[PDB]
Design a protein around this ligand. Structure first.
Ligand SMILES: [Zn+2]
Lengths: 176, 122
């Protein structure tokens, strides 16, 4: 059951580290939108009866090493830039064996509801994934470099579709 | 007066729907949206919000059905045409997505988001 589990949310970047930024008139900063996303997901997860730990709760710098918080699952939230502005969509990254089921489960439910192109579940060595024994995934929830993804990253109603689809995946992930 | 320089006011129904959606009460949002559409009090934003609700709690497929229904009533809606362009891009139907965004550009040829997506899809 998802109810009673501890979920760690890691909004990427923060503080002096802005993360990626769009080139449009919006001049969006990745650090601002990962944190909005994590705070929204925190509320929805707590309504579902999960305990939520945040690697940061405000616009503060946190080193990758200091993002190693324990839980039953761990979701790193990013809105990175790709060099082609036409590249777009959502990716879920896993690295250790025990992270794959989480990435495969979330990729399936997010595809059903989210308005992002599905770039799939991929194996990649990110330090927040490699440094932890917790089932952890890195979510790219749209690329801030893509103008049309950016319109959805900036939009609470689109974010909330993504956030519900993540909750849907966690409920399947924790079905035992 | 000064209220044409300002944003378009949401009507009361859309504001109630949105407020339930952002407080996470998608059940009550859906009921308010349903009643608004059935009484014929809906505008294109009502159909937009209704399908967004469906994408959130039902499926993207049902959301897209609801937006297409809204376009039958509001064929020149930039909101609904843009949203269906985004949705069809997410399903890798870029030829259909490009049709939709060009309709949205018909409504609003200076809109930089519509321009950006059409540029992307061209
Ligand atoms: Zn990032």
């Amino acid at each position: 059951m998802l109810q009673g589990k501890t979920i760690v949310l890691d909004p990427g970047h923060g503080g002096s580290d802005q993360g990626a930024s769009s080139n449009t008139k919006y001049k969006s900063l990745e650090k601002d939108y990962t944190l909005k996303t994590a705070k929204e997901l925190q509320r929805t997860l707590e309504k579902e009866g999960a305990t939520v730990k945040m690697t940061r709760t405000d616009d503060t710098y946190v080193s990758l090493e200091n993002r190693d918080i324990k839980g039953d699952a761990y979701l790193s939230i990013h809105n990175d830039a790709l060099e082609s502005s036409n590249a777009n969509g959502m990716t879920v990254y896993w690295y250790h064996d025990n992270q794959r089921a989480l990435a495969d489960t979330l990729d399936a439910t997010i595809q059903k509801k989210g308005l992002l192109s599905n770039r799939g579940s991929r194996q990649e060595n990110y330090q927040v994934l490699a440094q932890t024994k917790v089932p952890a995934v890195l979510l790219e929830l749209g690329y801030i470099s893509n103008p049309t993804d950016e319109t959805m990253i900036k939009d609470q109603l689109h974010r909330q579709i993504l956030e519900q689809a993540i909750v849907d995946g966690l409920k399947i992930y924790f079905s035992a | 007066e000064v209220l044409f320089q300002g944003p378009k006011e949401d009507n009361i129904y859309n504001k109630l729907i949105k407020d339930d959606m952002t407080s996470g009460n998608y059940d009550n949002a859906q009921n308010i949206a349903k009643q608004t559409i059935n009484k014929n009090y809906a505008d294109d934003q009502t159909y937009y919000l209704s399908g967004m609700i469906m994408a959130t709690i039902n499926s993207k497929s049902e959301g897209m059905t609801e937006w297409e229904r809204g376009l039958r009533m509001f064929p020149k809606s930039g909101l609904l045409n843009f949203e269906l362009a985004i949705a069809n891009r997410s399903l890798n139907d870029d030829e259909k997505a490009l049709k939709y965004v060009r309709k949205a550009l018909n409504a609003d040829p200076k809109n930089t988001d519509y321009i950006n997506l059409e540029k992307e899809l061209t």
